[PDB]
Amino acid sequence: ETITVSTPIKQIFPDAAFAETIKDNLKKKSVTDAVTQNELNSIDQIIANNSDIKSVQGIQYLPNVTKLFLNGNKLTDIKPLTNLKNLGWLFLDENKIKDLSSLKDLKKLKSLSLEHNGISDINGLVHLPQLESLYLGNNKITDITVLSRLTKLDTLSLEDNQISDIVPLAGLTKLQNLYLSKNHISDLRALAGLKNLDVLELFSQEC
Ligand SMILES: [Ca+2]
């Protein structure tokens, strides 16, 4: 939503680490400083990797954010991201995010990264058919059936998982970069129809 009157940063953003992030972003002197909706509207990018952030509550007041770098934090719930319709790049590596339902309405999201999140079920990704790059390395994924719906992908990383069947990748003609090392792949027939592959990693398969 939005704030109708000047309000302290710490009152909008409960997480102290995230409040500090917003304070630096808006170039304020203290998280106790008051900010307006106009100022929150000016934010189109948040760079907060390894910032010890546990919650991004309050981010719902930043309608124009398009880039969100939140790698290496302590995130679990990303419900606050649900209505950030303009999100184009979302990096959430090294967190513990498993509920991907909050991404369903991010129809402009083009790049999504969720490596090292202990994820196994990615069926929620079906709602992101426009996705162009996807990084899901170092998780516990085995079933990638859903990926057949992401026909716009040109870059996909599924390295260090537990995948055996990659037939779902067969129809992803736009794939240029595919990372599948450290999995359980034996059958490579699914790669017969891929004409645009430039990068392909299949080493260290444990069958
Ligand atoms: Ca600072």
Swiss-Prot record:
Domain LRRNT: 1-41
Domain remarks in the Swiss-Prot or TrEMBL record: Has an N-terminal region with 8 leucine-rich repeats (LRR) and has 3 GW repeats in the C-terminus. Residues 241-319 form an Ig-like region, followed by a 72 residue-long flexible B repeat region. The GW repeats mediate non-covalent binding of the protein to lipoteichoic acid (LTA) on the bacterial membrane. The GW domain mediates binding to host complement component 1 Q subcomponent-binding protein (gC1q-R, C1QBP) and to heparin; heparin binding dissociates InlB from the bacterial surface. The LRR domain forms a curved tube, the N-terminus of which has a cap that binds 2 Ca(2+) ions.
Reported impact of D24A: No Ca(2+) binding, no change in Tyr-phosphorylation of host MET, wild-type invasion of host Vero cells
Placement of LRR repeats on the sequence: 40-62, 63-86, 88-106, 107-128, 129-152, 154-172, 173-196
Family of the protein in this entry: Belongs to the internalin family.
MF GO annotations: heparin binding; lipid binding; metal ion binding
Residues holding Ca(2+) 1: P14, A16
Subcellular location: Secreted; Cell surface; Cell membrane
Disruption phenotype: Deletion of both inlA and inlB prevents uptake of Listeria by human enterocyte-like cell line Caco-2. Single inlB deletion no longer invades various cell lines. Decreased synthesis of phosphatidylinositol 3,4,5-trisphosphate (PIP3) in green monkey cells, decreased infection of host cells, decreased association of host PI3-kinase catalytic subunit with tyrosine-phosphorylated proteins. Deletion no longer Tyr-phosphorylates mammalian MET.
Lineage, highest ranks first: Bacteria, Bacillati, Bacillota, Bacilli, Bacillales
Entry protein name: Internalin B
Any one cellular-component term (Gene Ontology): extracellular region
Residues that coordinate or bind Ca(2+) 2: E20, D24
GO terms for biological process, alphabetical: entry of bacterium into host cell
Protein origin, superkingdom: Bacteria
Residues included from the entire protein: 36 to 242 of 630
The protein's assembly and partners: Monomer. Interacts via its LRR repeats with the extracellular portion of mammalian host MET; MET can bind HGF, its endogenous ligand, and InlB simultaneously. Probably forms a dimer upon interaction with host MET, which subsequently allows dimerization of the host MET and subsequent host signaling; dimerization probably occurs via the convex surface of InlB. Interacts with host complement component 1 Q subcomponent-binding protein (C1QBP). Interacts in vitro with human intestinal mucin-2 (MUC2) but not with mucin-1.
Keywords noted in UniProt: Calcium, Cell membrane, Heparin-binding, Leucine-rich repeat, Lipid-binding, Membrane, Metal-binding, Repeat, Secreted, Signal, Virulence
Biological role: Mediates the entry of L.monocytogenes into normally non-phagocytic mammalian host cells. Its host receptor is hepatocyte growth factor receptor (HGF receptor, a tyrosine kinase, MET) which is tyrosine-phosphorylated in response to InlB in human, green monkey, mouse and dog cell lines. Downstream adapter proteins GAB1 and CBL are phosphorylated in response to InlB, which also causes cell colony scattering. InlB binding to mammalian cells is saturable and inhibited by EDTA; InlB-coated beads can be taken up by host cells.
